[PDB]
Amino acid sequence: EWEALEKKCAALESKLQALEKKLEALEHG
Amino acid sequence: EWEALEKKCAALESKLQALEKKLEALEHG
Amino acid sequence: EWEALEKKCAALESKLQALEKKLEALEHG
Ligand SMILES: [As]
Ligand SMILES: [Zn+2]
Ligand SMILES: [Zn+2]
Ligand SMILES: [Zn+2]
Ligand SMILES: [Zn+2]
């Protein structure tokens, strides 16, 4: 159960970095 | 404490989902 | 361990708030 949450937040960190990069692209057209 | 962090992480997941939705609508719509 | 995960999830919340504001910027030009 603790391990599951840790993996979850790590997945979220991954997804978030992906979104940040995608938004940087879209910002620039 | 456990409940609080689990709820926070889950909210973050929902929010990330909502933002990627909005990003897709901006990019394509 | 617990404190580091709380710190991480907090940093993720901050980053997601920044990204929401940025997406809203782009929705408006
Ligand atoms: As988290
Ligand atoms: Zn930039
Ligand atoms: Zn630029
Ligand atoms: Zn808006
Ligand atoms: Zn507006």
For tokens 């391990």, what's the residue?
Answer: A3
Q: Are C9 and A8 in contact (CB under 8 A)?
A: no
Q: Are A15 and B23 in contact (CB under 8 A)?
A: no
How far is A25 from B7, CA to CA, in rounded Å? 31
- Quick check: CB of C9 below 6 Å from ligand 1? yes
For tokens 């940040």, what's the residue?
Answer: A20
- Secondary structure letter of residue C29 according to DSSP: -
Which residues in chain C have Cβ-Cβ distances shorter than 8 Å to B15? 16, 20
Size of interface B-C (CB pairs under 8 A): 24
Structure tokens at A1: 């159960």
What is the amino acid identity at position C2? W
Pick from A15, B14, B22: nearest CA to C26: B22
Out of A6, A13, A26, whose CB is closest to C12?
A13
Resolution of the structure in the document, Å: 1.8
List the single best residue of B8, B14, B16, B28 to mutate versus A (max A Cβ within 10 A).
B16
For tokens 């889950």, what's the residue?
Answer: B10
